[PDB]
Amino acid sequence: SCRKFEAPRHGSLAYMPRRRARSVKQSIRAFEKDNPEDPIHLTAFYVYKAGMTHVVRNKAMTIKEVTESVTILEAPPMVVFGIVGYVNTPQGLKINKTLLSSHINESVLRRFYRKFYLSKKRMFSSGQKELDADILVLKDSDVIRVLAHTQVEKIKSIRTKKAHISEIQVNGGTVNDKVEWAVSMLEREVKISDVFSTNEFVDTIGVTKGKGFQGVTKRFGTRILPRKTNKGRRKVACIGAWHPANVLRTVPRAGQLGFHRRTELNKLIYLIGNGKEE
Amino acid sequence: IKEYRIYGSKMPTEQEVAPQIFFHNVFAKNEIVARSRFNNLMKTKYKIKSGKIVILKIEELVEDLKDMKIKNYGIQLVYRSKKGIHNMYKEFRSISRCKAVEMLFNDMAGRHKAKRDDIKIVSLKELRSEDLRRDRVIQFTKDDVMYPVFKKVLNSKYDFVLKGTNIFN
Amino acid sequence: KNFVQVGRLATPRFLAQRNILYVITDIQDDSMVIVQDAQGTRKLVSVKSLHLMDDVVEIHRDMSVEEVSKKIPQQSENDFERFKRELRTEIEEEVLR
Amino acid sequence: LEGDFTARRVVFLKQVENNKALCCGPAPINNVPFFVIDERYLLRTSTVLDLKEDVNIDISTVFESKRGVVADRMDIDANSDQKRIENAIVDAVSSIRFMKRYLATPFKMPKFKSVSSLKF
Amino acid sequence: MKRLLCEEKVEIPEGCSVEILERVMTVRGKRATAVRDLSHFVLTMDVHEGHVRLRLWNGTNRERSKLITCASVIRNCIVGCMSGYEYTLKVVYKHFPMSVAIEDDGKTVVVKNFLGQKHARRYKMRGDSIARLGTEKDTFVVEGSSLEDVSQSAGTIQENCQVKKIDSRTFLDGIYFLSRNVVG
Amino acid sequence: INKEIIVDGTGHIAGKLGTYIAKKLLEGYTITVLCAESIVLTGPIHRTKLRYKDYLNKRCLVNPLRGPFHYKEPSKLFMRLVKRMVPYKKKRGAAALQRLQVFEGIPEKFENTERSICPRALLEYCANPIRKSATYGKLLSEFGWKHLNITEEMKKKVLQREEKAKKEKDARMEEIQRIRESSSFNKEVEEIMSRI
Amino acid sequence: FDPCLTAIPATFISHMRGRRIVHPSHSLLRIEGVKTREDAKFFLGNGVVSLYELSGKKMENRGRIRRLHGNSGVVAAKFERNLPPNKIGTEVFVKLYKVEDDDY
RNA sequence: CCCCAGCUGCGCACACAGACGAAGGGCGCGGGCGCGCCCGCCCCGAAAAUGGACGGUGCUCAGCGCAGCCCCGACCCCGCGCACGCACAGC
RNA sequence: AAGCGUCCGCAGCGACGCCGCUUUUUGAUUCUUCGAUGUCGGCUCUUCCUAGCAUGGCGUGGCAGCGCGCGCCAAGUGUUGGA
RNA sequence: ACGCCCCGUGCGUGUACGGCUGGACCUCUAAGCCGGAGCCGCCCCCCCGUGUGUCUAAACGUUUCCGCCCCCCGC
Ligand SMILES: Nc1ncnc2c1ncn2[C@@H]1O[C@H](COP(=O)(O)O)[C@@H](O)[C@H]1O
Ligand SMILES: [Mg+2]
Ligand SMILES: [Mg+2]
Numbered sequence A: 001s002c003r004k005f006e007a008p009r010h011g012s013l014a015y016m017p018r019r020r021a022r023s024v025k026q027s028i029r030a031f032e033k034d035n036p037e038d039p040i041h042l043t044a045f046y047v048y049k050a051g052m053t054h055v056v057r058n059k060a061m062t063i064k065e066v067t068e069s070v071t072i073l074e075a076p077p078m079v080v081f082g083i084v085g086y087v088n089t090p091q092g093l094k095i096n097k098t099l100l101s102s103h104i105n106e107s108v109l110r111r112f113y114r115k116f117y118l119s120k121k122r123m124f125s126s127g128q129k130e131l132d133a134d135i136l137v138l139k140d141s142d143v144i145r146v147l148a149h150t151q152v153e154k155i156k157s158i159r160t161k162k163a164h165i166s167e168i169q170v171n172g173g174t175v176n177d178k179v180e181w182a183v184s185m186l187e188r189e190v191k192i193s194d195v196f197s198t199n200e201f202v203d204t205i206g207v208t209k210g211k212g213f214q215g216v217t218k219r220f221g222t223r224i225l226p227r228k229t230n231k232g233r234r235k236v237a238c239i240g241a242w243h244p245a246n247v248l249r250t251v252p253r254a255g256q257l258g259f260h261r262r263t264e265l266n267k268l269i270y271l272i273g274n275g276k277e278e
Numbered sequence B: 001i002k003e004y005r006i007y008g009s010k011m012p013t014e015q016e017v018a019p020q021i022f023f024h025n026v027f028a029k030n031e032i033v034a035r036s037r038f039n040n041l042m043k044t045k046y047k048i049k050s051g052k053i054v055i056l057k058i059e060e061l062v063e064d065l066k067d068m069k070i071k072n073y074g075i076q077l078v079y080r081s082k083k084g085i086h087n088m089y090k091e092f093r094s095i096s097r098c099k100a101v102e103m104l105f106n107d108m109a110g111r112h113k114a115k116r117d118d119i120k121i122v123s124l125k126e127l128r129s130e131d132l133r134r135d136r137v138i139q140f141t142k143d144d145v146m147y148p149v150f151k152k153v154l155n156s157k158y159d160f161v162l163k164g165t166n167i168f169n
Numbered sequence C: 001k002n003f004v005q006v007g008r009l010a011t012p013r014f015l016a017q018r019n020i021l022y023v024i025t026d027i028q029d030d031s032m033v034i035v036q037d038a039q040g041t042r043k044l045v046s047v048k049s050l051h052l053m054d055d056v057v058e059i060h061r062d063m064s065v066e067e068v069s070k071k072i073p074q075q076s077e078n079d080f081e082r083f084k085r086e087l088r089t090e091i092e093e094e095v096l097r
Numbered sequence D: 001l002e003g004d005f006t007a008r009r010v011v012f013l014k015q016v017e018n019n020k021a022l023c024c025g026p027a028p029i030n031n032v033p034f035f036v037i038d039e040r041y042l043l044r045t046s047t048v049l050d051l052k053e054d055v056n057i058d059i060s061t062v063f064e065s066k067r068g069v070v071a072d073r074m075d076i077d078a079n080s081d082q083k084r085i086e087n088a089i090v091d092a093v094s095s096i097r098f099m100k101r102y103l104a105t106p107f108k109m110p111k112f113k114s115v116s117s118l119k120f
Numbered sequence E: 001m002k003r004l005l006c007e008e009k010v011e012i013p014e015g016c017s018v019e020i021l022e023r024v025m026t027v028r029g030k031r032a033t034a035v036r037d038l039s040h041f042v043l044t045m046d047v048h049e050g051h052v053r054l055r056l057w058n059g060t061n062r063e064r065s066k067l068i069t070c071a072s073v074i075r076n077c078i079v080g081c082m083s084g085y086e087y088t089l090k091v092v093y094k095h096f097p098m099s100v101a102i103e104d105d106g107k108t109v110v111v112k113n114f115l116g117q118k119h120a121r122r123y124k125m126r127g128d129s130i131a132r133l134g135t136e137k138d139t140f141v142v143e144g145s146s147l148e149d150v151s152q153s154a155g156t157i158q159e160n161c162q163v164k165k166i167d168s169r170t171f172l173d174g175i176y177f178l179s180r181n182v183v184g
Numbered sequence F: 001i002n003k004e005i006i007v008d009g010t011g012h013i014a015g016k017l018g019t020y021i022a023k024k025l026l027e028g029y030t031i032t033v034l035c036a037e038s039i040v041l042t043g044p045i046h047r048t049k050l051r052y053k054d055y056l057n058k059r060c061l062v063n064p065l066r067g068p069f070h071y072k073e074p075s076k077l078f079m080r081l082v083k084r085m086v087p088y089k090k091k092r093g094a095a096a097l098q099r100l101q102v103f104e105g106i107p108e109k110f111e112n113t114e115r116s117i118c119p120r121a122l123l124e125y126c127a128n129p130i131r132k133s134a135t136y137g138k139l140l141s142e143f144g145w146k147h148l149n150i151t152e153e154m155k156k157k158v159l160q161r162e163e164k165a166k167k168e169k170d171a172r173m174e175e176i177q178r179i180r181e182s183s184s185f186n187k188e189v190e191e192i193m194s195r196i
Numbered sequence G: 001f002d003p004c005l006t007a008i009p010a011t012f013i014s015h016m017r018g019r020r021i022v023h024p025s026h027s028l029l030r031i032e033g034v035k036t037r038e039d040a041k042f043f044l045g046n047g048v049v050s051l052y053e054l055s056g057k058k059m060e061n062r063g064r065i066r067r068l069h070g071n072s073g074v075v076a077a078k079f080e081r082n083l084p085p086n087k088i089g090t091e092v093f094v095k096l097y098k099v100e101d102d103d104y
Numbered sequence H: 001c002c003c004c005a006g007c008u009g010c011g012c013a014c015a016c017a018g019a020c021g022a023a024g025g026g027c028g029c030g031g032g033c034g035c036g037c038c039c040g041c042c043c044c045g046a047a048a049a050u051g052g053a054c055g056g057u058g059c060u061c062a063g064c065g066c067a068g069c070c071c072c073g074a075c076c077c078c079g080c081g082c083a084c085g086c087a088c089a090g091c
Numbered sequence I: 001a002a003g004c005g006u007c008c009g010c011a012g013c014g015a016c017g018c019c020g021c022u023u024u025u026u027g028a029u030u031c032u033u034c035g036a037u038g039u040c041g042g043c044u045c046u047u048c049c050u051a052g053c054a055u056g057g058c059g060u061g062g063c064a065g066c067g068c069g070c071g072c073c074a075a076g077u078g079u080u081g082g083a
Numbered sequence J: 001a002c003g004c005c006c007c008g009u010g011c012g013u014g015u016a017c018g019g020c021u022g023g024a025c026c027u028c029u030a031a032g033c034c035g036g037a038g039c040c041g042c043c044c045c046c047c048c049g050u051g052u053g054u055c056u057a058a059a060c061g062u063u064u065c066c067g068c069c070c071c072c073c074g075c
């Protein structure tokens, strides 16, 4: 029969199944819409979370002083070392041509090894006579992305020399000029100030803090059962009706909480600065 | 189907040596339905039931289709629906009388779901073009009528063929 | 666009029976039509069962069977003859080299 | 159709006892010796040669080709009357223009379109 | 009733050429040239003897009704591509003066202060249609080369600028059709 | 026997094409269906959309990960049609389904191939022109298949290359015909038959 | 010797069956090019062979086209050994000579 | 088509219809009778709870009707052989 | 559709009657279960239906506005704290 | 968490419905067309598993680094 008092569902079904993320680095699943009248620019960057503080800012409406929590994302410049071109196929997007630089350093080829200290470092032994043929087929692409890696050794607090590699879409005009910019930027660093600016909204993609196997009260916020409850209070009591004779996937069960991929929209950049300058 | 003229009478006895001879013109599938449609009319017009009927003659009325033109036929019929019994008058153009009633049966079945046994024909008269009452059959009585074929029809039995092959023409 | 009219030549719609000529002698309705064979026999057929040829023959509504059959235009293989046929193309492809 | 030779145009001579048939596609022309097979395995074609000679030959030693076995028989023999009646159908094949190529060529199936096309 | 043949022809006047291939029609008139697709009709379209002929064989009353609309849509496309249509619209208001104004060279009409509303109702013009103010004030006229794009462009304004959610008997303000006629 | 058929899907009624496809598949034919975005569903489009929304509504409430899967491509939706015209749970029907490959448009693997049609399943043969109809790509482009325009553009570039090669090939059929009719060729031919 | 040189290939499409009950002694064949019942009358009584391999060794299972089947030129054949349902969809070769019901 | 076996013709219907239904209705279409009736098809009336059932696929000539010729299909019937029973040229 | 509704059968109602639907009531029955299917309510938690309460779009009024009534489409999101 | 931040807009089919043109004298309808719902579908977001692209490797089944991975060790 009908439940006596109605209430919203505990937790979103949009994020169920709550599984662990497949990686710690998340690739951009969707870049912004490429506008040919826009100038050539990159669309993403890869930063590292340093910590939080709060700023005080004047909120003009009369002026009222407000304080707001901010968070500081350390962004060493990313080195562009490859180009990936895509074509619009009736099955979707397809790799048209991958063009790498002749130089791949010890940081970014640490990523290609599981145990690097025991390795022989022979990845990417790799001709420059085929560049113009590879640039020409790359000009036939529909979507141009650069292969950029992070410079994780520049942080030095993270005991990680192994770099994070990702594709960043080159948005601008006339795919000819996209790869002419991209071959210019091979083995060059891209600053965070070149990609973003202050008071603009960005989307952050990352993996949450892992909480391990958690019960339903933390995982979903279901009500703790009363004090008299035999066999446990931090539960959902009825996990399903008699029919259907299975448990639905919509019922909150105990499992993995945290270490999920999350994309948060419209995070405003308050300040872009350098950690050395005051 | 076929047309039958079935002659019959009461079986002659010592009391009635020459009974009155009757005949019925039936459009039937065969002679056994034609005997059956004759026996009901002797049972219901007169009171002669089928045990006391002798069927004197059954002949197939067949037309000579020597030069085979199309005649017009006006058919007065009585058909029984699920709801009642009604009179209808239908006009057809056909080859023979026995083909025109086949056009009657396929039309009453298509338009009214009247089965062949649910239909009794009052009269079938071959008509002039001037005496036709249906304007649809009048259109084809005009000389020099012409129309094209717009339905596609295949020129063989095919399961799969290449694209270039003509199949309709 | 070939029309169904009296005097329009026709053949059976099947390709294996295209050797037979018909001529439309009378029109019943949208769908049925009397055709006359070159052998003089007439039969009522469907319009869908015919493939209309391009030619129309000078026939009017009430003509005799002999009168229409005057105006209809006039219309096997062995293994050895098939061999002689296939050998002809056998050499014909060799000359083109 | 089913013999040692099994796609070879030959000519038919005589029907023999126990359901057999004497045949010789002439050994100069198509390299086929005298043989007897079953009567049914001969697919009949419409063309007949004009052979007037008597075909009552000394069949006692002729190589009989069975159905499935492709057993390699011994080569050609003395051929007392076989040489004469072979030359009579080489005489018959010379009168007709392309018939020499016909008996030499192995049989190919006609491209099927109907069973009327399978008349032979 | 299934007549054996229903036929009507549309007399192509002098100065325009009509070309019909596989039930699409290209008219080349003085005012504009429009290419019209009539393949939703099941008809034989041919232009012969200077009048486009539509013929229907053994057609039902449903089909020959569609014969006539194909004839009237060809009549309208011809004199739209020859003369051109224009629709006249009267702006009616009791209390608040509506101000209609054209932008984008007559490709859009703004309507402001409709019933004292702040929201500016813009209405775009479906292709090859031009709006301008009426020579009489409190009127604007939309004019173009096809009756459907003219009467829909005017028709959206007559549909959207009525008064809804307040009583339409007491509130009579809105834009209405006055007169519908061809150019000249 | 050449038991490999390449079907062009334009102008075909879907379930009527699928019966002749599945009956061939169970007899050992390997069928490939091209241009599956143009396979036709008869009737007006709104009835066909309600049939699709009825399909989308059916899912496992307990676990839709194992529910009735809903296909937005015309190729996988047409594959789903022929899937149940064979006995696919048995090994004879699943083996037959491995001989289907259904594609939208013409991929360049199928450039210059020889495409077939099922004329008993054609829309111009079966349907009345009074009746409405709609293709798969007309339906499914409003149900999440985003690739209608890129299919038709790449379809056109294949058909223009094939029309180009047909313009070259039939000219070679023209000149070979004009050569084989020439009296120089004939007396060359009767000279060889003289020597045989 | 190729089978397609002298014999017409026919695809083994089904056994003779009901909707459910299957009688495997009679195999239904579809001869190529044969599309009508009167066309298949040319092949009544004709021998038929199904060629297969057992441990790489070639075998001939011989049969006779026994009766017609349907209106579409499908014929029913009875072989020495019944055809397995594995071979449904594969080809068997129809001979051009008649054989008898006793003697294949 | 699953699934053995279909073709030739003539009609009719468009409603996610055929594929549960009433009273009462429908300038919906097709026939018929004297604007009103009648007959077919369709429509409205016609709303249930896991997602889902003309059996499914699907079908708009795979629906609703008819005709012609054909085909498939039981251990039935027929014929033959064998087993067993009988009072046994057989049943 | 008798009547009511200022006049006005149908804006909205609607008697006297009649036709249905539903299985959310209770019976009727006794088909399943008596070598047992744990019997009310609540708490908890999920889902579904629409005969739609709110929220979205509308049509209608005996709708001036404000409001209220009647009807339509739509089951997305909601539908509380207490004696 | 009792604290703080983000959940923003869009696009499309098209419901009811309003319209346009327009037939069988009007007519939103029979053909066609326009607009149109918190619905529906995309987009976004999350998950899945299959693919795509790139990189890389010696000897004579054994030697063994020839390419590596895994355990072990630490965090
Ligand atoms: N009953 C009909 N009367 C007139 N034209 C028709 C009819 N049926 C089809 N058509 C037209 O015939 C053409 C298609 O015929 P087809 O030559 O078969 O492609 C199209 O222009 C149709 O509109
Ligand atoms: Mg307790
Ligand atoms: Mg079958």
Ligand SMILES: [Mg+2]
Pocket (backbone or CB within 6 Å): none
């Ligand atoms: Mg018995």
Ligand SMILES: [Mg+2]
Pocket (backbone or CB within 6 Å): none
């Ligand atoms: Mg128990």
Ligand SMILES: [Mg+2]
Pocket (backbone or CB within 6 Å): I037
């Ligand atoms: Mg229990």
